[PDB]
Amino acid sequence: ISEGTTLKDLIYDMTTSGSGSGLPLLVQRTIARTIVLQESIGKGRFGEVWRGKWRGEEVAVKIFSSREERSWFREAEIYQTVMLRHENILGFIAADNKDNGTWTQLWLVSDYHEHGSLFDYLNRYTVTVEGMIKLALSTASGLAHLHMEIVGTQGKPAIAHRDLKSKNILVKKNGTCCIADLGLAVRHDSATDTIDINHRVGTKRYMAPEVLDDSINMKHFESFKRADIYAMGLVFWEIARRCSIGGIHEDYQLPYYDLVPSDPSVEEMRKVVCEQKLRPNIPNRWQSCEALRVMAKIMRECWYANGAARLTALRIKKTLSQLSQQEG
Numbered sequence: 001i002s003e004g005t006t007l008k009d010l011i012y013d014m015t016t017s018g019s020g021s022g023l024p025l026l027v028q029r030t031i032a033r034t035i036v037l038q039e040s041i042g043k044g045r046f047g048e049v050w051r052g053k054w055r056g057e058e059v060a061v062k063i064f065s066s067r068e069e070r071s072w073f074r075e076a077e078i079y080q081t082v083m084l085r086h087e088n089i090l091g092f093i094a095a096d097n098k099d100n101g102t103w104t105q106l107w108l109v110s111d112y113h114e115h116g117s118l119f120d121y122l123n124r125y126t127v128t129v130e131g132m133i134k135l136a137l138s139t140a141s142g143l144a145h146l147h148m149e150i151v152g153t154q155g156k157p158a159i160a161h162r163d164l165k166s167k168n169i170l171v172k173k174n175g176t177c178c179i180a181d182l183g184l185a186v187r188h189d190s191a192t193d194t195i196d197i198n199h200r201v202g203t204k205r206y207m208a209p210e211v212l213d214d215s216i217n218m219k220h221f222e223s224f225k226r227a228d229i230y231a232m233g234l235v236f237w238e239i240a241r242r243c244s245i246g247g248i249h250e251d252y253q254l255p256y257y258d259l260v261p262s263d264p265s266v267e268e269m270r271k272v273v274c275e276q277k278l279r280p281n282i283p284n285r286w287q288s289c290e291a292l293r294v295m296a297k298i299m300r301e302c303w304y305a306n307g308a309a310r311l312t313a314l315r316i317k318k319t320l321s322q323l324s325q326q327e328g
């Protein structure tokens with residue numbers, strides 16, 4: 001990397017470069033190793049994510065714990081898949097490694113979005129009925145592009161987030177969300193019908209019914225695409241459940257808070273979803289605006305305790321794409 005180069009020039013030179021692929025290793029490496037960590041801004045089992053500057057430009061640095069090396073690899077593998085780089089899918093910058101044995105350091109460097117995750121934004125603020133759409137449409141524009149199975153030269157195989165939730169969604173400056181945390185994600189090659197997979201994963205909450213009572217078929221790459229939606233459905237609930245309309249904007253709450261204890265189990269969740277087939281009670285005061293209902297629609301159009309029955313991702317994309325025209 002030459003004197004004066006800016007992260008912008010890198011990314012630009014990249015997108016507009018021959019192949020729609022990430023930056024050259026040696027370069028990704030140079031970046032990671034010259035980043036200037038600022039201060040931790042979030043932790044987890046996956047490790048911990050910090051905020052840092054690269055030659056002045058802020059950046060996000062997710063730092064895994066050697067013990068969690070595979071989680072690191074998968075993301076690195078995926079965020080670099082042939083041509084996945086939507087406007088709603090976390091801009092991947094680089095991945096690197098550093099020591100030996102017990103202390104090996106694994107990093108993933110992305111783009112920094114001040115606002116943070118939805119689960120934080122939905123707690124710090126109260127979106128507009130207008131914003132509720134940008135946020136919900138983008139998420140949808142994203143999960144679409146992720147399942148969007150292209151084919152040919154370098155057709156991005158269809159991918160399934162396998163763990164979409166209010167925390168793994170980041171919101172930009174212009175109130176545009178973007179998918180993130182593709183660690184548990186899986187790919188699907190259409191030219192040989194394969195899946196690089198392998199049990200019950202994801203957050204014990206937004207788990208779809210198929211998985212909860214185990215009666216799901218992993219042979220067909222749909223059981224995956226499907227569960228993506230239901231979960232993305234629960235996420236919509238939270239968004240509007242925190243939307244303002246003249247004063248009423250019920251406190252933020254995680255899906256199924258009044259039914260099962262905080263930090264649920266597979267059993268405690270399997271009872272209120274499989275059995276009771278109960279969903280987050282959509283307050284009656286919801287049938288107010290023409291938009292607000294479209295959500296309450298999709299929200300149940302997703303909460304079907306039946307796989308195939310759920311709406312497609314690409315769909316909600318088109319429907320909210322239209323409801324975006326007529327409104328605002």
Ligand SMILES: CC(=O)Nc1nc(-c2ccc(F)c(C)n2)c(-c2ccc3nccnc3c2)[nH]1
Pocket residue numbers: 041042044049060061062075079092093108109110111112113114115116117167168170180181
């Ligand atoms: C659960 C959770 O917080 N997941 C999660 N993974 C990442 C991340 C960061 C860098 C990177 F390269 C990759 C691939 N992912 C982030 C993330 C990304 C950008 C952020 N920008 C500001 C604040 N927090 C952020 C947090 N959040």
